[PDB]
Amino acid sequence: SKLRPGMFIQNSNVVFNEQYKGIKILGKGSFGEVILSRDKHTGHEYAIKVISKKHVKRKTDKESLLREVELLKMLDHINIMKLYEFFEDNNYYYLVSDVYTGGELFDEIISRKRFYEIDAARIIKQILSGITYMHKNNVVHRDLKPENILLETKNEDMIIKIIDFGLSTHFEYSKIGTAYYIAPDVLHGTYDEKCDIWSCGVILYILLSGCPPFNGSNEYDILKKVEAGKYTFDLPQFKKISDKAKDLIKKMLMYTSAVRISARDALEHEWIKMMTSKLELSIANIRQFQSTQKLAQAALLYMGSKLTTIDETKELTKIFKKMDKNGDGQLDRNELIIGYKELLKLKGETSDLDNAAIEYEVDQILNSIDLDQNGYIEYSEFLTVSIDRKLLLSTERLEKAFKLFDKDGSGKISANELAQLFGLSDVSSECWKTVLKEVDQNNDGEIDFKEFRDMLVKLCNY
Ligand SMILES: CC(C)(C)n1nc(Cc2cccc(Br)c2)c2c(N)ncnc21
Numbered sequence: 001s002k003l004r005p006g007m008f009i010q011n012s013n014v015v016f017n018e019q020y021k022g023i024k025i026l027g028k029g030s031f032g033e034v035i036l037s038r039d040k041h042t043g044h045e046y047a048i049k050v051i052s053k054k055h056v057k058r059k060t061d062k063e064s065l066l067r068e069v070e071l072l073k074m075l076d077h078i079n080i081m082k083l084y085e086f087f088e089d090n091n092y093y094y095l096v097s098d099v100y101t102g103g104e105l106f107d108e109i110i111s112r113k114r115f116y117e118i119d120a121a122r123i124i125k126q127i128l129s130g131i132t133y134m135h136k137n138n139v140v141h142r143d144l145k146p147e148n149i150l151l152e153t154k155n156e157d158m159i160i161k162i163i164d165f166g167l168s169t170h171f172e173y174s175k176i177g178t179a180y181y182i183a184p185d186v187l188h189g190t191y192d193e194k195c196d197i198w199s200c201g202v203i204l205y206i207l208l209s210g211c212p213p214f215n216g217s218n219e220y221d222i223l224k225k226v227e228a229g230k231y232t233f234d235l236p237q238f239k240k241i242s243d244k245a246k247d248l249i250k251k252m253l254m255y256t257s258a259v260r261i262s263a264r265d266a267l268e269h270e271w272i273k274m275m276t277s278k279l280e281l282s283i284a285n286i287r288q289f290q291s292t293q294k295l296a297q298a299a300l301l302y303m304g305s306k307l308t309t310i311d312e313t314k315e316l317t318k319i320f321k322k323m324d325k326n327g328d329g330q331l332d333r334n335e336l337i338i339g340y341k342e343l344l345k346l347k348g349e350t351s352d353l354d355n356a357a358i359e360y361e362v363d364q365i366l367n368s369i370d371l372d373q374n375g376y377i378e379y380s381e382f383l384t385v386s387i388d389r390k391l392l393l394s395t396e397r398l399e400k401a402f403k404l405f406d407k408d409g410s411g412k413i414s415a416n417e418l419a420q421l422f423g424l425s426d427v428s429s430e431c432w433k434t435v436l437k438e439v440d441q442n443n444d445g446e447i448d449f450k451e452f453r454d455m456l457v458k459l460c461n462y
């Protein structure tokens with residue numbers, strides 16, 4: 001968790017397979033992190049997903065994965081992520097793909113001023129076209145979420161790009177919005193290509209209403225409704241939505257996979273052929289549903305970072321204690337890096353990419369401190385700044401998620417929305433309510449952002 005999006009590593013000179021030079025971290029996806037990399041010889045830029053062998057187990061043998069890759073390399077579709085190459089070392093699996101500067105689908109949608117029914121039709125059509133092509137070539141996604149649906153460019157020429165296709169069949173860990181889209185076929189272990197239709201049917205339902213078919217402020221609550229398969233159109237949003245659109249959803253959300261509509265039949269459905277041929281939807285509900293998920297995970301990452309950083313601080317202090325032989329408290333720049341590495345060795349786990357992140361971590365803390373030019377640093381001061389910087393980064397991510405959440409709000413969070421946020425964060429109702437008392441002083445039932453953060457801090461303290 002030492003690699004953040006946007007961070008440059010080209011000074012570190014990290015090379016993958018002796019031909020791909022790491023340059024910029026684009027972020028993190030399924031099973032690993034994605035790194036912008038340039039070809040050492042040609043100069044092509046690529047996106048490389050870095051899956052580590054220690055954190056992520058493999059569900060299949062080495063022969064089957066290679067055959068799957070060779071199949072994915074020969075597949076070309078406008079809505080499917082291109083896979084150029086697969087390789088591995090002692091610590092990582094590497095997947096080389098194209099660079100998509102667009103971003104997630106639901107993010108671009110809630111960044112727009114408004115959303116129409118025709119827009120949702122064009123989006124679904126591209127998705128189904130990609131799913132159809134992959135199904136014809138016997139490839140199943142199994143894990144289709146709005147996170148796995150990107151755009152090629154920042155446009156308008158909207159081009160949907162489906163990613164992580166076929167990765168879930170071979171990989172498994174050894175986020176928060178996954179239970180909404182998972183098919184009952186997968187939950188029963190007996191899945192086929194029809195599960196991707198279910199996932200797409202759920203997305204269409206959300207694109208049209210702004211609300212999940214199978215809702216809940218908790219994974220167990222959501223998965224129970226998915227298991228039941230009981231959904232409805234009893235919403236104010238579906239009152240203006242065409243019967244053609246409802247007919248498509250009904251066919252895609254069939255519990256029995258044999259009865260469930262296929263990808264090509266859905267692509268040739270009456271609703272798509274009419275709406276994408278040659279009425280404005282609730283964008284507020286989509287924005288509410290998306291930002292709530294984003295703010296909730298930002299809350300988890302905040303509390304997660306603060307709590308994790310404390311324990312490693314107590315761990316690095318022990319290590320730095322055994323390195324400070326004169327007891328002056330000052331350590332070398334080289335000694336600080338060694339301490340970080342000895343933390344990993346005592347945990348079993350270093351890699352050159354990992355060593356690069358460590359140096360970057362150390363330097364960024366040293367760049368925040370008025371350094372004495374004797375070459376020595378107080379490690380207590382070092383760890384203190386380390387804590388504050390990680391707290392600062394967590395707040396900035398919290399500010400960005402809140403900005404999206406409060407686009408058309410009163411600047412405050414309700415008491416109900418906290419229940420939805422902390423519910424998805426698996427936080428006990430007795431916990432955040434007791435903290436809400438200390439945070440809300442005028443008993444308004446509503447609180448601003450600073451007060452919301454104070455809650456997260458006090459929760460790490462309870
Ligand atoms: C937003 C971010 C998480 C940084 N991401 N994720 C992917 C998807 C992806 C999926 C499988 C293998 C690779 Br390479 C890349 C991806 C991409 N293909 N291009 C640019 N960013 C990407």
Ligand SMILES: [Mg+2]
Pocket residue numbers: 323324325326327328329330331
């Ligand atoms: Mg010393």
